[PDB]
């Protein structure tokens, strides 16, 4: 009751001392010799103009042409971004959806929200219509994120402070990841899909092993709830966007914060983060109604994506890196190049 | 310049757009109400006349109502409370008999203060329901209101106590200009609660319409 708390304090002391010992040079003084990327000019190439309420999530397909967007009018829309055509429009059973996923194979999409259920939709049916393939139940809080591992495995994060790995064939929870003391708001799968990171409301991000299930590392430094998380393309780092108007780059191998992406003018939380194809650009969606793009190695604003009349709620970059898509609380998606 | 398949895909997209517009027009004719309370406050008893979120549908005078009872959402309220920014009104239910102990009405006023003075619900009117008026009368006949309210200069009569409780809930509103609180001392009674909600919703809709044409 007391010796356990004292022992835990000693472990935190040891962890922080080791982290400080391994901190011999910040990458600010290491990358200072590089020439900055300069001003970044992106323009709204497309404006997807079908939704009628707040857009809460969006996900690019692996083909870098199809994207799915979830909005609060209870509609899942699949867009042909090249031509702004609506491939599908899926009516959701529950209008309250906060997350949306696109299967890497492209055969499925996932949705979830305040109904505490992750619903899998089959896109390629012989009937020609999109049918719900399975409703995954078992979360006791709202669903905040979901990411497909393959056609049969999907990992979901919920507001009940737990992340779960599902088996869509049977609909059961293969693994449960319980180490968070606050609602898990974001999720990001490693490029090799052997790990994933989750950012919760306790201002901490955790690295999990999907194969068996345990928090390998815990990353702190944020002063408020973490709303967004994204893996570096290398897979050895990740970025977090939180409510304290800052983005931080953490390092898996060094087990430390690397850089902080903050500015005095920005005082709003971050709703979404994503990296560019090479990882040199970090794009974050803010409550200032606009998205900032940062030099991931220099930590300075390389540009601004200002085209939305409300808060930018979702944001993603294509697999080939050709474009970024931002959804806002105004019912529009915009593709920037 | 499009091919035959491209033209057919554009036609399918147009059909999808038409369906989306029709469903949006149908949805915009519904009144969305957020039902809030402290559990035993009487939300179920308010609902009776008509694992995540709960939706209840009912019709009154050719008007369709959708009531969302968040209820068993034991998460951080500020994480998902912005989802309901845009509901027509908020139905807040409190139990007048919750001044006994376990202070419970103090939690009710805390929740009312948090919801009313929320950045998302800046201009959404609140329909306040004060359930259990007969239980309130029975409790007042023996226990006083001083136990829950440290300062109170009034006789142990139902009328004065209820008026003071209504006033003490109403002054918690800080944005008294842009938002109106409608109070109804509800009970089992008859279908007067639905009529009160309809009147309040009609007032809110009239204000919204005046905002749309820009003379409010």
């Amino acid at each position: 009751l007391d010796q356990l708390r004292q022992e835990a304090e000693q472990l935190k002391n040891q962890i922080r001392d080791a982290r400080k010992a391994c901190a011999d040079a910040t990458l600010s003084q290491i990358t200072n010799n590089i020439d900055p990327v300069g001003r970044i000019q992106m323009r709204t190439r497309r404006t997807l103009r079908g939704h009628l309420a707040k857009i809460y999530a969006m996900h690019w397909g692996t083909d870098s042409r199809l994207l799915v967007s979830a909005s609060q009018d209870g509609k899942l829309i699949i867009w042909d971004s090249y031509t702004t055509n609506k491939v599908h429009a899926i009516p959701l059973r529950s209008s309250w959806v906060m997350t949306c996923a696109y299967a890497p194979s492209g055969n499925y999409v996932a949705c979830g929200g305040l109904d505490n259920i992750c619903s899998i939709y089959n896109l390629k049916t012989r009937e020609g219509n999109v049918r719900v393939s399975r409703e995954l139940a078992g979360h006791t809080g709202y669903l905040s994120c979901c990411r497909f591992l393959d056609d049969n495995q999907i990992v979901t994060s919920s507001g009940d402070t737990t992340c779960a790995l599902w088996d869509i064939e049977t609909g059961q929870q293969t693994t449960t990841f319980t180490g968070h003391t606050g609602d898990v708001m974001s999720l990001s799968l490693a490029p090799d899909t052997r790990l994933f990171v989750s950012g919760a409301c306790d201002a901490s991000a955790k690295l999990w092993d999907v194969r068996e299930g345990m928090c390998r590392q815990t990353f702190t430094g944020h002063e408020s709830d973490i709303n967004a998380i994204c893996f570096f393309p290398n897979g050895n780092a990740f970025a977090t966007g939180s409510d304290d108007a800052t983005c931080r780059l953490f390092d898996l191998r060094a087990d430390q914060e690397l850089m902080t992406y903050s500015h005095d003018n920005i005082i709003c939380g971050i709703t979404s983060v994503s990296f560019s194809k090479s990882g040199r650009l970090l794009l974050a969606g803010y409550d200032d109604f606009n998205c900032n793009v940062w030099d991931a190695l220099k930590a300075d604003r390389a540009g601004v994506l200002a085209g939305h009349d409300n808060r930018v709620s979702c944001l993603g970059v294509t697999d080939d890196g050709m474009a970024v898509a931002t959804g806002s609380w105004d019912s529009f998606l915009k593709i920037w190049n | 310049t499009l091919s035959a398949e491209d033209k057919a895909a554009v036609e399918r997209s147009k059909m999808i757009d038409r369906n989306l517009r029709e469903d949006g027009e149908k949805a915009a004719r519904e009144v969305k109400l957020l039902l809030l309370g402290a559990g035993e406050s009487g939300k179920s008893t308010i609902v009776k006349q008509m694992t995540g979120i709960v939706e209840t549908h009912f019709t009154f005078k050719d008007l369709h109502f959708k009531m969302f009872d968040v209820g068993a959402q034991r998460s951080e309220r500020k994480k998902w409370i912005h989802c309901f920014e845009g509901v027509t009104a908020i139905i807040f239910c409190v139990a007048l008999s919750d001044y006994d102990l376990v202070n419970r009405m103090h939690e009710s006023m805390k929740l009312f203060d948090s919801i009313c003075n929320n950045k998302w619900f800046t201009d959404t009117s609140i329909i306040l329901f004060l359930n259990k008026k007969d239980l309130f009368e029975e409790k007042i006949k023996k226990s006083p209101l001083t136990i829950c309210y440290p300062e109170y200069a009034g006789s142990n009569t139902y009328e004065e106590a209820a008026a003071y409780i209504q006033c003490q809930f109403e002054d918690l509103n800080k944005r008294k200009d842009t938002k109106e609180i409608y109070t109804h001392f509800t009970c089992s009674t008859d279908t007067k609660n639905v009529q009160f909600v309809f009147d309040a919703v009609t007032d809110v809709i009239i204000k919204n319409n005046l905002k749309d044409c820009g003379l409010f």
């Epitope: 055509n85 491939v87 219509n129 | 310049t1 091919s3 035959a4 398949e5 399918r12």
Partner: single-chain antibody
Framework: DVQLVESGGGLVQPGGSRKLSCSAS????????MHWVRQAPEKGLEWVAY????????YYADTVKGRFTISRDDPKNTLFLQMTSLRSEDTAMYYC??????????????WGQGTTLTVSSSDIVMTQATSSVPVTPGESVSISCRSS???????????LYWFLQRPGQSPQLLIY???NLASGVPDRFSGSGSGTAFTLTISRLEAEDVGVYYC?????????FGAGTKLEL
């Protein structure tokens, strides 16, 4: 499952006005564009009429324009072909192909069983050269097809479709847009080719593969089929 039953056949005196019906049962008929494709007693397939989902677009072949009338009736999933002034050239078997059009879709995937109607007594030329080649099980055969016009479009996809008509049943889609393999088709079938030159290769050919193979153009209407390449032995 997906079904398309044809009714309204029989023997018609010339100048008659017999109507053809096709009832769909097993798929979202309202979202599928429908086609009528006729087949003469011994000739190959010939496109007739097309009505899109929602009936907003209708196309006819020049041979039947002004005499045939196609129409859907969505509530109970029936497709009609009102034909008037029937001539001896209309003696054929009529199919009720369904085709849905979006990005990545496979049009012409399902064909009806067909009903036989007997009448008493600038388009792209899609050339299939050879009409019948002898094959043996376990071998590989490349069926060739040529187009008068380049089927490659600015979108980057060449609109050429491959169909197989096994003896005694309706044609089935094998390859759509000259590369993609249709769902349910074994991976042995492979499609390839460039503008105005397309081939279909059946690696490790065996039984239940004999029949006529038709190469079809979907670049723009009227849709034109090849003569058809017969596979026997």
């Amino acid at each position: 499952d997906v079904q398309l039953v044809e009714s309204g056949g029989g023997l018609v005196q010339p100048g008659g006005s017999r109507k053809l019906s096709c009832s769909a049962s097993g798929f979202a008929f309202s979202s599928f564009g429908m086609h009528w494709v006729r087949q003469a007693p011994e000739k190959g397939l010939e496109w007739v009429a097309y009505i899109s989902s929602g009936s907003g677009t209708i196309y006819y072949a020049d041979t039947v324009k002004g005499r045939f009338t196609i129409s859907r009736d969505d509530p109970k999933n029936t497709l009609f072909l009102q034909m008037t002034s029937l001539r001896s050239e209309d003696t054929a078997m009529y199919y009720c192909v369904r085709s849905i059009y979006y990005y990545g879709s496979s049009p012409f995937d399902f064909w009806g069983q067909g009903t036989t109607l007997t009448v008493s007594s600038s388009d792209i030329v899609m050339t299939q050269a050879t009409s019948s080649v002898p094959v043996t099980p376990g071998e590989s055969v490349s069926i060739s097809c040529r187009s008068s016009k380049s089927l490659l479009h600015s979108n980057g996809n060449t609109y050429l479709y491959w169909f197989l008509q096994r003896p005694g049943q309706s044609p089935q889609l094998l390859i759509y847009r000259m590369s993609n393999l249709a769902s349910g088709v074994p991976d042995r079938f492979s499609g390839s080719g460039s503008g105005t030159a397309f081939t279909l290769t059946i690696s490790r050919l065996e039984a239940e593969d004999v029949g006529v193979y038709y190469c079809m153009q979907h670049l723009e209407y009227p849709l034109t089929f090849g003569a058809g390449t017969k596979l026997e032995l």
